[PDB]
Each structure stands twice: as C-alpha cells, then as structure tokens.
C-alpha cells in the first residue's frame, strides 16, 4: 500500500540529495508525526495512521459487536452425534444478529460519508458474511429439505446484494436499441437470480404477450402458463417443489413436441427458457454471466440439495472464472469449496473488526481447519481478537477501551496473570478525562488485583496534573 503523507506539500521533489526523513508514532492513532532534519525543511507533518476508522458509527458498530460477543458468552469449540444443538442453533442466531449489526453499520455509513471506499469494503465483507451464513449457518450441516424456507431466502439475498450487474443502466441498453437475442440473455439472467418479479414485469414490458395472442395462441397460452408458474413458485417446502419441477418438465416436453407456428429463433428462445426453468445443466451454465449465477441456478432448479455443491461450483468455475476485480469472489468460492483459512486474511484487508469477529464466530461453530497471548491458538481467533484489542488500545476512543479490556479479559488464551500483565501495561494509557470515569479504572484495578496502579493513577489525578488550571471544575 502506497499513500502520500500530504497530497499538498511534498518535501522531496528531486531524486538527488536525499534528506534524512524522521517519523515518530504517537500515543494516539490518528496523530503521528514526521519531520526532516535539513536546511530549509522546517515543516512538521501530521500523518494519521493509514486505513483507519475514527467515525462514531464505527464505535457504535464495535460496541454492538462486543455486546453480541459477550452475549454469546462461553462458546469455543465442540462430526458428532450426541446431546443437542447447544451452541449450534445459538450460534446461528448470533450469526444473523451480527449480520444485522453489520448492515446497520453500512446503512449509517452510506448516510454520513465523505469517502465511499470504506462503504465498498464493508459491502464486500457483508457479501462474504452472507455467503458464509448461507453455507454453514442455516442447515447445521444437514440438507436443504430440512429447512428450505430459510436457506433460499438467504441465498437469493447473498446473490442479489453481491454484484451490481442487474441495474438500470444495463437494462436500458437492451430496452432501447424481443427480436434481439440480448433480451433472452437478460431474462435468463434474472431467472438464474431468483428475480422473479423483475423478470415477469419486464414481460409486460417485453413485446411478446399481445403478439403471442396475435400469433400462435398456444404458445401464447403456454407462455402465460409459465408466467403464472413463476408467480406460484413454492419456497416453503421441498415436497411442494417436487411437483413444481415435475410440472415444468412436463411443460417443456409438451412444448418441445408441439406446433412451431413462430420464428425459428423465437421457438429457439422459448425452449431455452423452459429448460433453464426445468434445470438443465447446459443452459443454466449457458446464460450465466458469472459463476455465482450458475451456482444459484443449480441449487435453484436442478437439485436443491447441498451435497452437489462441490460439483456445481466446479461446473460454474468451468463457465466463468473467479473475477479478480473484487475481493469477495474468491473468498465465497473458497467458502463454498470447504477451505476457510484463505478468506480470513482477505477480510482483514477489508475490515479488521469484521474479520476478527468473523473468525470468532467461525471457531464458535467449530469449523476448524510458545505461550504468548499474541500467539496462535486453535484457529488463530485469539490473534484476530487480541490484535483488534491492541489496535483499539491506540485509537484513543475512551468509549471503546471497555471493549478492548473486556475482549482481553475474555480471551481463552493466556493466564489470569497474562491478562493481568496486559491490563497492567495498558491501563495507564487510558484516556480518562472526566471525574466519573476514573471509577472504571479503579474498579478494574481492584478486579484484577492491581492496587499499585490504582494509587499511581490517583497520584496523576493528584492536583489535576499539578494544578494545571485555575477553577479546575468537575467538567
């Protein structure tokens, strides 16, 4: 990552005569200093720590995530066939809770913002979290028939929000210049996305219904029966689905062996549509612009069970390779295909808080695969957590220091004395500024048996830092 310290006054212009540049990290995150020990270079440069979040919405998001973490209490790691759901069911409830929390964060960011790149990173993290919850946070390792209503509702969500290919700019390109092939590509792209209402609506928009009445009726009836069929699509039960796909296959067979009173290309645009709905693997893969459109189709219309996922993704990856433009595609691709180790780094490139708590709830679900605190444990979740805690300690936001101290006190790694050492070394740097806040410091000193730091902090409070004011009121 290459960032300019100042996009205004660059102190070095030429390559020759290199100047001794000096830099010092400040006790506060967003206030570090740089300078130059050279003639005619007497400017001080405040360079805030790169890629950071100082907004109040971020602090409320971290407060909410730490509440859910403390709310989740004692869960670490537990296939198996014994006892009950325990953490499993509870873990999912917690997963959809943090997903709601991340969405509220993204909403408050889109409202008050100056840079939108943070909004882009958060939405990429939300897309990966949607994929993760769809893949391992609904069925609890089982199949789709167990709980079809929830699974699809999440899948149709994860696809819909993920990309932005279905948009007003794209449709108008094809809506402005039925006969054209592109129309059917977009219709099948809508179908592969479960965007039923959009597809049906475009129908009215589409040239065909009156014209079908004008031409072969039968086909027109048929197309109307297929429009009706998509309105009556069942999401609640797999048994209802079984009849549904049976009906679509009977309709596709009946039309394939029927009268051809239309154009060859129109006959050749209706059979596809019927067979994409039927779930034939070729043309789900044909009219797919990306791989997740393919994967969404195979889950939707061929077989709705989780098992053939390994196959589906492979076939989809044989149609449209992983788009490296964004940072969520390969993660989701890896997430679907078992491997989860690779995605934790990429999400840490997006947001450290989201990535840390993601690794936390993943360990909580299990999903796995010399005695420092900053050292790897089972799944390096303590790393993600304790490092995010250490990162927060420098942020200078006193509303988040309780989060950091709590997150360290809740680490499964490290002795009681290891956390005692950490608190003893970290607590003096706490930005106490109000007279009622020091009760928190003294209570923690009592809680972790550090009375020496308690009295050493009251000495600094002594005389308000040696009579550093006049009135020196409570506020």
């Amino acid at each position, epitope marked *: 990552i290459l960032v300019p310290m100042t996009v205004n006054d660059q102190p070095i212009e030429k390559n020759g005569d290199k100047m001794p540049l000096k830099f010092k990290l400040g006790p506060l995150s967003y206030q570090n200093m740089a300078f130059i020990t050279a003639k005619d270079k007497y400017k001080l440069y405040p360079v805030r720590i790169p890629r950071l979040d100082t907004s109040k919405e971020f602090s409320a998001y971290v407060s909410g995530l730490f509440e859910i973490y403390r709310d989740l209490g004692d869960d670490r790691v537990f296939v198996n066939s014994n006892f009950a759901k325990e953490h499993n069911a509870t873990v999912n409830l917690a997963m959809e809770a943090i997903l709601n929390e991340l969405e509220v964060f993204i909403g408050r960011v889109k409202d008050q913002d100056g840079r939108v790149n943070r909004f882009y990173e958060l939405e990429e993290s939300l897309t990966v979290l949607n994929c993760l919850r769809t893949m391992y946070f609904i069925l609890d390792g089982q199949d789709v028939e167990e709980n079809r209503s929830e699974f699809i509702e999440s899948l149709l969500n994860w696809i819909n929000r993920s990309d932005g290919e279905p948009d007003e700019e794209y449709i108008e390109q094809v809506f402005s210049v039925f006969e054209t092939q592109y129309f*059917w590509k977009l219709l099948n792209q809508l179908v592969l996305r479960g965007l039923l209402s959009q597809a049906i609506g475009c129908i009215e928009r589409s040239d065909l219904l009156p014209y079908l009445s004008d031409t072969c009726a039968v086909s027109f009836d048929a197309v109307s029966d297929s429009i009706e069929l998509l309105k009556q699509y069942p999401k609640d039960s797999s048994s209802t689905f079984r009849e549904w796909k049976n009906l679509v296959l009977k309709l596709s067979q009946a039309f394939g062996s029927s009268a051809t009173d239309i154009s060859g290309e129109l006959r050749d645009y209706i*059979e596809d549509f019927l067979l994409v709905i039927g779930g034939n693997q070729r043309k789900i893969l044909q009219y797919s612009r990306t791989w997740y459109e393919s994967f969404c189709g195979f889950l939707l219309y061929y077989i709705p069970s989780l098992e053939l996922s390994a196959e589906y993704l492979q076939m989809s990856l044989e149609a449209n390779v992983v788009d490296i433009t964004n940072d969520w595609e390969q993660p989701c691709v890896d997430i679907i295909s078992g491997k989860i180790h690779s995605i934790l780094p990429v999400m840490e490139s997006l947001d450290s808080c989201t990535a840390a708590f993601t690794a936390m709830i993943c360990e909580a679900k299990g999903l796995i695969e010399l005695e420092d605190l900053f050292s790897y444990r089972n799944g390096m979740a303590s790393y993600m957590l304790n490092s995010f805690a250490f990162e927060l300690c420098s942020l200078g936001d006193k509303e988040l220091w309780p989060v950091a101290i709590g997150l360290i006190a809740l680490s499964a790694t490290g002795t009681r004395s290891a956390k005692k050492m950490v608190i003893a070394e970290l607590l003096p740097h706490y930005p106490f500024v109000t007279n009622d806040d020091i009760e928190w410091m003294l209570s923690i000193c009592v809680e972790w048996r550090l009375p020496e730091i308690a009295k050493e902090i009251y000495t600094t409070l002594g005389n308000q830092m040696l009579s550093a004011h006049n009135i020196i009121e409570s506020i």
Partner: nanobody, 125 residues
Framework: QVQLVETGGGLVQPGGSLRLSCAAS????????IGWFRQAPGKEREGVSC????????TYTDSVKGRFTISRDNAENTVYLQMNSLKPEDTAVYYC??????????????????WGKGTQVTVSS
C-alpha cells in the same frame, strides 16, 4: 431424410473476415459432437471448432484460438463460425458436422452419411 446446409464462404484478402453459417435436423438435447471441421487441399480433415456442452464450453483447435469464434443458437441445429484475422493457413474446404439425436446409445451409425456439403474458404497472400 435430413440435410445439413451451410453458406457464407468465399474469397477474401489476408486479415479479412468471413462468416460461416450452418443448419440441421433433430438437434435433440446434449451429448453433441457438432462443429466445424476443415480440409486443406491434399491434407486430412482437422477439427476447427466444436460446441461440446450447450453453452457450457467450446473446443477450438490451436491454430484458430483467439481469431475464430463459434456460436450456437440455443437448443437448435444451427452454428456460426466468425473467422477474424484470416491468413493463408486457413485456406480449406470447411464442413459442418453434427449429430441427429442425443443419447449415449452405442457407437454406431454416426448421424447420416451426408455431412455438410462443404463451403470453400480461401484467403490469398
């Protein structure tokens, strides 16, 4: 009695373009071997392009990859071969090849004996 008619051939200059078209009967589901082959004068017939899956993928030969483009109309017995950046190495008689129905069956009676009648594609130097 089904047929395989093809058109679009002709005589063009090096670096020019041509568009080959072909039609057929049955074209029933997948398991296809349907595609363009070519035969140079005196040489043996080599495969140019072929639609393996129904839009899932394509099989090109290594002398036309990046220049030729094959497309098929969905679930239909037609093919188009767009020949861009034609060179004197593409001078041949091109043939449309296919399969009447699509079942694993047994390896006997490949379609019908009449394939494509041929269209002459020659690119000068």
């Amino acid at each position: 009695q089904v047929q395989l008619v093809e058109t679009g051939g002709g005589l063009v200059q090096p670096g020019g373009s041509l568009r080959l078209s072909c039609a057929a009967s049955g074209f029933t589901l997948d398991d296809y071997a349907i595609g363009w082959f070519r035969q140079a004068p005196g040489k043996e017939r080599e495969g140019v392009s072929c639609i393996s899956r129904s839009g899932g993928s394509t099989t090109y030969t290594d002398s036309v990859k990046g220049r030729f483009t094959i497309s098929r109309d969905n679930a239909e017995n037609t093919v188009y071969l767009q020949m861009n950046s034609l060179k004197p190495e593409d001078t041949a008689v091109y043939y449309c090849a296919a399969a009447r129905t699509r079942g694993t069956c047994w390896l006997n009676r490949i379609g019908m004996d009449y394939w494509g009648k041929g269209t002459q594609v020659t690119v000068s130097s």
